[PDB]
Amino acid sequence: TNPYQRGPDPTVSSLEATRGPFSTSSFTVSRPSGYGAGTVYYPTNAGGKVGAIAVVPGYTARQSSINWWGPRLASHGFVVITIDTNSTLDQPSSRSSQQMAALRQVVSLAGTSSSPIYNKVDTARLGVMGWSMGGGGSLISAANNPSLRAAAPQAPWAQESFSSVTVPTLIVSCENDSIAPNSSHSFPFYNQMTRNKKANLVINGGSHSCANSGNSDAGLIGKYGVAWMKRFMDDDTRYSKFLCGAEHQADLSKRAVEAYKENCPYLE
């Protein structure tokens, strides 16, 4: 019996929906520690401690580009911190350092009795997401910290190799990306990672911003993001059917999916 399992049995319906089952709130970090600014999204009624996720944007970009993930994941039972970097012009290694510093402040606030997330966070269960250079930073965070339970980068941009990564990594890639082209970032990163559970969802027609706030594939992308995080943060095999099973197979017929790659099964 999984002590980390939270919320009702998932359906295609509930995963494609705008919100998960849990009531949500948020707050602005009063005094950011090692990063520019952050907003914390948390569930009020998950029925136990939840893992935590830090989401970083790309070059020139702010919280607004990626903060749709805040309520979307929080409502499925995660604490999510969306950050602004010290500078809009920070590169991947600095993005990764600021990501880890944000996770550190979430963990710290979860031990602060005055904090809304006081005692809500399993500080051993942490995840990383981010857009482009922030998604490169997510792959660097993973390679530097193998105790992280899940990575979900979108249209990642990096000049590194990730052959060493042992953290479970989904890449969301955009087909017509000219900023982080898949033939020199996403697809090499997927081929480099030989030591982990991984997947690569390629969104059909998508520009560089195909997975950002207000995107028109939020049903599909929201579903794979939540199911991945829920499978690897919470060891919740109830979500395996969406990643490796019959529900996953039904998704491949859709126009929105140019291609999907994985190394299923993900065994316990």
From TrEMBL:
SUPFAM superfamilies linked: alpha/beta-Hydrolases
GO function term, MF aspect, one: carboxylic ester hydrolase activity
Superkingdom field: Bacteria
Disulfide bonds: C174-C210, C244-C264
Pfam families from the UniProt entry: PETase (PF12740)
Cellular component GO terms held in the UniProt record: extracellular region
Transmembrane segments annotated in the record for this chain: none
Subcellular location: Secreted
Keyword Iron tagged: no
Keywords linked to the UniProt accession: Disulfide bond, Hydrolase, Secreted, Signal
UniProt keyword Aminoacyl-tRNA synthetase, yes or no: no
Listed Polar residues bias regions: 11-24
Ranges of residues in domain PET hydrolase/cutinase-like: 1-265
Residue span of region Disordered: 3-24
Family according to the record: Belongs to the AB hydrolase superfamily.
Full protein name: PET hydrolase/cutinase-like domain-containing protein
Organism: Piscinibacter gummiphilus
Phylogenetic classification of the source organism: Bacteria, Pseudomonadati, Pseudomonadota, Betaproteobacteria, Burkholderiales
